[PDB]
Amino acid sequence: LVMTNNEDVSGAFVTLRVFRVFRIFKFSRHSQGLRILGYTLKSCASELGFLLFSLTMAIIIFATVMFYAEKGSSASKFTSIPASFWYTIVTMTTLGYGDMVPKTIAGKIFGSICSLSGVLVIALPVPVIVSNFSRIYHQNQRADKRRAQKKAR
Amino acid sequence: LVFYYVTGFFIAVSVITNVVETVPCGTVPGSKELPCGERYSVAFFCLDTACVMIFTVEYLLRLFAAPSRYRFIRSVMSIIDVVAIMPYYIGLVMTNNEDVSGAFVTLRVFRVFRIFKFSRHSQGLRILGYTLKSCASELGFLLFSLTMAIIIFATVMFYAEKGSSASKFTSIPASFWYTIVT
């Protein structure tokens, strides 16, 4: 309202229009699920930090290696280390869009290593996170049943 | 505490600058576009030399106080700092005067190997290393199984899809890529 399209430029309004979806979170009080997932994200806060750090340095290492391996080629779309974060987070996560693929005989080796390394690195939190999700949900389940057994009395 | 919070600073500074030295930025309206790392040659030369200095000064005082001034040299971080620094000293001994494109990146790549100094900072990297060592029996079997499975499936796909129009399966060495992708 304050800034209706009279005083507006294309590079100034979507940055707040995007936030409109942020109202979907009000569903929290409706579903025990979103709130319990938030609580178990908070309870596991120690693990996501290590996941983020490991992911970041692994991206760095493998981006440098693939960059220097596949740098000199015909139209090698690995123009930069900032241009090989995309490829490496695609590979490490086993997406594989196929827009950038190595074509050396060294780049292939390092990509094949990169994919397994990503499978390894990312599979560290997903044990504990799902374990604690189950844990908190069963805790609340026995909580509700305990209160109900109290309401028997 | 402050020594730790200030030595964690310069590993990071070198990492970030080694990252950025490749970003093509600066249109250079006079000539073609250059990587930032070389157009500002002295800017990054000073940074690299300075962080080399900091790592060396840390390394000396680290070594000097070891019970075994030798068992510290066989350490897990000894070779870390050694190979962290050395590709600079060879960058001095072999400055671009005596250099060929196929001889210098093979040591320039090692520059990222200094990122491992973050080990003593985070319990995570060290514990992950210790559990890689504790599971050393399983990675061997994984490597062997992967290698023979690649062999088998590469041969099978090779002989199946060999005869086709532009069948890019020209070789068993040409069907390791496809099979480790799949």
Are A82 and B125 a contacting pair at CB < 8 A?
A: no
In this structure, the number of other CB atoms found within 10 A of the CB of residue A129 comes to: 18
* Amino acid making up residue B40: Y
Residues found in chain B: 182
Residues found in chain A: 153
Q: Which residues of B touch A57 (CB under 8 A)?
A: 115, 118
Are A81 and B22 a contacting pair at CB < 8 A?
A: yes
Q: Is the dihedral of CA A91, A96, A97, A103 positive or negative?
A: positive
From the list B180, B170, B151, B149, the residue with the least C-alpha distance to A96 is B180
8 A C-beta contact, residue A93 and residue A122: yes
In this structure, the number of other CB atoms found within 10 A of the CB of residue A71 comes to: 16
Residue A66 half-sphere exposure toward CB, CA atoms < 13 A: 34
* SS3 assignment, position B6: helix
Are A81 and B19 a contacting pair at CB < 8 A?
A: yes
Label residue B7 left, alpha or beta by phi (over 0 means left) and psi (-120 to 50 means alpha). Answer: alpha
Are B22 and A96 a contacting pair at CB < 8 A?
A: no
Give the C-alpha separation, A103 to B105, whole Å: 18
**Residue B124 to chain A, least CA–CA distance (Å):** 7
* Amino acid making up residue A124: L
- Residue listed under structure tokens 């930069």: A80
Give the C-alpha separation, A63 to B55, whole Å: 24
3-class SS string, B86-139: HHHHHHHHCCCCCCCHHHHHHHHHHHHHHHHHHHCCCHHHHHHHHHHHHCHHHH
Give the C-alpha separation, A13 to A26, whole Å: 23
- Residue listed under structure tokens 């060294």: A106
Q: Which residues of A touch B20 (CB under 8 A)?
A: 81
Please give the class, per CATH, of domain B1-124.
Answer: mainly alpha
In this structure, the number of other CB atoms found within 10 A of the CB of residue B109 comes to: 16
Give the C-alpha separation, B109 to B113, whole Å: 8
8 A C-beta contact, residue A124 and residue A50: yes
Give the C-alpha separation, B181 to A101, whole Å: 11
Q: How far is CA B95 from CA B92, B100, B102, in A?
A: 5, 11, 14
* Amino acid making up residue A112: S
* SS3 assignment, position B10: helix
Q: What is the DSSP string of chain A?
A: -TT-TTS--HHHHHHHHGGGGGGGGGGGTT-HHHHHHHHHHHHTHHHHHHHHHHHHHHHHHHHHHHHHHHSSSSS-S---STTSHHHHHHHHTT---SSS---SSSHHHHHHHHHHHHHHHHTTHHHHHHHHHHHHHHHHHHHHHHHHHHHH-
Residues of B with CB under 8 A from a CB of A: 15, 18-20, 22-24, 35, 101, 105, 108-109, 111-112, 115, 118, 122, 124-125, 128, 176-177, 180-181
Q: How far is CA A27 from CA A30, A32, A37, A46, B33, in A?
A: 5, 10, 13, 27, 51
Q: Which residue of B has its CA nearest to A83?
A: B23
What is the DSSP secondary structure assignment for residue B169, as one 8-state letter? -
Are B23 and A82 a contacting pair at CB < 8 A?
A: yes
Q: What is the DSSP string of B23-48?
A: -B----TTS---BHHHHTHHHHHHHH
List phi, psi (to 5°) of B40. Answer: -100, 65
From the list B66, B106, B64, the residue with the least C-alpha distance to B86 is B106
* SS3 assignment, position B178: helix
Strand partners, A66: none
